Amino acid sequence: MTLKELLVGFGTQVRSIWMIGLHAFAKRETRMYPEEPVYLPPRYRGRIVLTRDPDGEERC
Amino acid sequence: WISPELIEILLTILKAVVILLVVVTCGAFMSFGERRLLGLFQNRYGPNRVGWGGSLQLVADMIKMFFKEDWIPKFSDRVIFTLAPMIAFTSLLLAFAIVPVSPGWVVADLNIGILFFLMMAGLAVYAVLFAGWSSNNKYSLLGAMRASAQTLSYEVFLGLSLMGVVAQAGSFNMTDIVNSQAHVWNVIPQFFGFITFAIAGVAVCHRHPFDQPEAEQELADGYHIEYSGMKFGLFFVGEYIGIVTISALMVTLFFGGWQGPLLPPFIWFALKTAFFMMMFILIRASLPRPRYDQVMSFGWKICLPLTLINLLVTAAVILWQAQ
Amino acid sequence: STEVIAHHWAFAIFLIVAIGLCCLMLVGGWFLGGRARARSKNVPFRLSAKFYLVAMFFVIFDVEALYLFAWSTSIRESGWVGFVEAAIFIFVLLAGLVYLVRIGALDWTP
Amino acid sequence: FEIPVGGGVSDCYTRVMLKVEELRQSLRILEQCLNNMPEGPFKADHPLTTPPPKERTLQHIETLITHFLQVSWGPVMPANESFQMIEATKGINSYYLTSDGSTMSYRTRVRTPSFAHLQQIPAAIRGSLVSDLIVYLGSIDFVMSDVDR
Amino acid sequence: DYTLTREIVTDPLNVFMGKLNDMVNWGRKNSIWPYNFGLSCCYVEMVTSFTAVHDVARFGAEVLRASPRQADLMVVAGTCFTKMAPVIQRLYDQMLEPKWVISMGACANSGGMYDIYSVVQGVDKFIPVDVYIPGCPPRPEAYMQALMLLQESIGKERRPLSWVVGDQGVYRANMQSERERKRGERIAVTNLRTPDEI
Amino acid sequence: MEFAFYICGLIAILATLRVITHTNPVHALLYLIISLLAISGVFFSLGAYFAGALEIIVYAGAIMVLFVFVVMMLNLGGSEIEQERQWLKPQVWIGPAILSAIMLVVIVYAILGVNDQGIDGTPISAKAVGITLFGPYVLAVELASMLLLAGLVVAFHVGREE
Ligand SMILES: CCCCCCCCCCCCCCCCCC(=O)OC[C@H](COP(=O)(O)OCCN)OC(=O)CCCCCCCCCCCCCCCCC
């Protein structure tokens, strides 16, 4: 490789190292399951149930 | 049995044993710290549940690898297969055996020094070759051949990168190398020596981006793939102990060793060593992995001429100011 | 001197305890944990001349490296004459390296 | 939105950067979707809209009948052949449906782009190294579910 | 209640040997190295659990070995295709003791929606499964919940401390079903959020 | 100092004996590496510190790495010559063993009549060796560079793949 290519490559390596270190200075984006409960939107498709009418009888 | 010479003999032996135990535990807890610092670099936490802050994660890994079933392949050659992790551990451990961590705290004040380090590096490439061949896996054999050719391509200039520091000190002794850095640390005059030694030290430790079992995973050609239990653990802990040894050698050869203005000398040595260990982690986190031919061509075409030119220029400078 | 013999004893104990430590971890790994059998557990999971060429280049340049190792520890008392001799040595080295690179000996890629 | 195009040569790198520009264009489309979302129905007013709107199903008998037959026996598609081609994430994806007048497809043919890209692999990687092959596989943007269906 | 693999037996558990068994179980359950094996979309959710937003490394289970010899856990995350079933069996046979299996997703559980000519109807037709995860795909925290369930199962199993001394049988605890454990809290649910909001 | 000398010499002799009679090439190279390590220990016991360092760095760290590399490349397994164990048959080795024993007896008899004040083991450093190498032995250094260049050119010409 050329000298200019080597110097530019070293500069890009330095930039990558610097950006990942600044990432180490950043805020964690981890959702701490299970101590922090998973937020689920109201129409989330998980466990199936059978429900009751307002009178208390089963709707099925 | 009451004599100052005998008391000094057991004092020196106890200091050597303390250095050995601290280095081995530092390598294992640096496997743990590798996990935690990669978590820090990637906006996460890493292992922080097994003990306080994950501090017992290493103990859990050690128990798991001890009580994992011991396995040797039936078609493998048992002696060489067993022997390869032993060399991968002991080579860079005995390379640490020359590092002066404090004034008066050294295991072996040898007249050869970094020559002993070069001896240990050659035995380390033996560990990689033996692990590849003894597994009776042709993929592991091919991967170990590539890893060994890479390691030779960088060990060809490792010592030459150290020769500028040796020339400035006028000695192979490590304490004389430290004492020659009393005014200016060697990273300023031997800057190209420092960068070539750092690249070669990463390469001979098979660290990223020179890690063959992680470089090519689609071929399944890693030379670790038949190792399990405590032999794979020996490979892991030996790799981390090698990182610790390379960091300590870089500190003592290019960053004044234990020398510092205010703090105690061991505190300065430990701080500089921990900084270079952390820089190993950041190198693993940040840089991508070049191609195999590109890596070996970089070692042969760029770094080795740079070490030769650096040695010649260092000699010219030394003889120029020798009035 | 008792300092050098104390350091020799410390070095010997260092090597012995390091070798015995890795031996002890291997023995403990072999001894502990149950063993199980499987049918395919025993089942495992021509290289070019460039490998030999690279290893051979490493050997030759390592010998020239030993010559420069011997030079570098005694540069001051070899003077400028030793500098001229080592410069001739290094020039022959770099000419050999240029020759190897230019003829494709160090080109893994086609 | 714009369609990013290359200079004439398709490497791993040019494919990856083209997908980066495609991501930026998709962000522009999403901004337009956020700013101008029309008011109206989320289901068509067609008798074959499956299922019908749920509130009318729950209180109107003809809608309940339509829902009952659509979810159980199935909607009756009159006998025809239809085709739809879209720009999927990994290339052009198409459905070719043949209906024989029943509540099930007589033939569902799914053209996926990853099948074609994996077939192109030997012509593009010939004369290269294995490292070039794994980088090429990383730059193709395929999944094996797309290839094998 | 325990099941023995060499039958339904009782607990075989000196007080020092119990402490050693607890220490070995603690070390095994806190160091679980999964095998990097991807079958289908469920594997995408598994490696999503490996990333920063979930950080499965916190449980000490991120190492993700490419060799079955270094792996303690096989996650069948995806469909057991008929062509891939010998591959799965060979990779499981190449794993070393102790080894655990998590079947992840409806395909690995039972064949899922793919009751089709080219799909084996569940990975438990030919290899034993320690933990099942329903879902298509299970979300990454469901994989983490199954990891914790596997940790609870490991923490009370009985395995030989050495292969030269003592009983060599593997005892697995007959744990209470999660359905029956959670039935009390699940049936008591009355109202949920209406699906018209965010 | 003599304890190390005699034990390292015995280890080197025994390892060489295992080398010249072994069947597996990788095992033979491992015993050769062990003998070179023992010879380096002999060098360190005599005060030749640079020689021992180069014995492990170059002989047991480069040349035998090349031998091991070639063996691993050749995939030497169940070779027909390897399986025969012709060198283990008495009628093959009894002649050369007698010849080597006679040569050893003559050389040892010549050795035992030389003047011997003993080796003090005073360490001759790498610095003095470097001074001698670039002083009186300058032509040796430059023509050794030429010799290794010749080895490089020959081995590239012969060991090419083409
Ligand atoms: C404690 C340990 C760490 C200490 C920190 C300092 C040392 C870091 C050591 C890292 C070692 C990594 C070595 C990587 C060498 C890669 C060389 C290579 O092959 O690069 C290939 C690339 C392109 O090559 P080319 O042939 O032109 O390709 C054209 C074909 N399309 O060519 C290029 O991209 C050209 C440039 C290549 C890289 C130049 C060297 C970079 C070294 C890493 C950055 C270090 C920065 C300082 C860090 C902080 C120090 C305190």
Ligand SMILES: CCCCCCCCCCCCCCCCCC(=O)OC[C@H](COP(=O)(O)OCCN)OC(=O)CCCCCCCCCCCCCCCCC
């Ligand atoms: C003692 C402890 C501390 C040790 C410190 C070690 C590091 C060296 C000293 C600091 C160097 C600072 C470098 C600053 C780089 C800035 C980042 C950057 O912008 O880099 C990229 C830039 C090229 O930009 P562009 O072309 O747009 O790239 C994107 C397309 N690829 O790239 C450039 O413009 C390149 C600019 C020049 C970079 C090199 C500067 C001189 C280096 C001299 C020493 C040689 C280093 C390499 C030797 C390798 C030999 C094997």
Ligand SMILES: CCCCCCCCCCCCCCCCCC(=O)OC[C@H](COP(=O)(O)OCCN)OC(=O)CCCCCCCCCCCCCCCCC
């Ligand atoms: C599985 C086991 C395989 C075999 C492993 C090794 C077996 C032997 C282990 C026991 C060793 C006992 C101790 C040896 C002596 C230590 C002290 C010593 O070497 O002192 C001599 C000399 C002193 O030099 P200095 O301090 O400068 O004094 C100047 C004037 N007095 O200092 C010197 O001369 C220093 C240079 C010599 C240091 C040699 C260190 C060991 C080298 C072999 C490493 C083997 C690595 C593992 C196996 C590799 C593959 C086979």
Ligand SMILES: CCCCCCCCCCCCCCCCCC(=O)OC[C@H](COP(=O)(O)OCCN)OC(=O)CCCCCCCCCCCCCCCCC
């Ligand atoms: C224990 C019984 C046998 C068991 C089986 C074999 C085990 C290995 C035995 C060989 C290695 C250890 C030999 C004993 C060394 C003990 C240290 C010693 O002798 O120190 C004296 C001297 C110190 O240097 P100096 O300053 O001259 O001091 C003279 C006194 N003031 O020292 C010196 O000058 C030189 C010091 C020795 C040289 C460095 C170490 C060489 C190691 C070579 C190992 C070769 C491979 C062995 C493989 C074994 C299995 C097959």
Ligand SMILES: CCCCCCCCCCCCCCCCCCCC
């Ligand atoms: C990564 C660092 C590895 C170091 C290995 C050796 C550790 C030796 C510890 C020696 C401690 C005492 C040093 C001399 C006294 C000066 C410092 C006093 C406060 C610690």
Ligand SMILES: CCCCCCCCCCCCCCCCCCCC
């Ligand atoms: C296929 C051909 C094989 C040829 C093998 C040659 C082996 C030669 C062995 C020579 C043995 C000499 C024994 C001692 C002779 C008497 C003492 C020396 C001469 C005075």
Ligand code: SF4
């Ligand atoms: S269970 Fe669903 S998400 Fe998982 S592999 Fe099967 S189809 Fe994919």
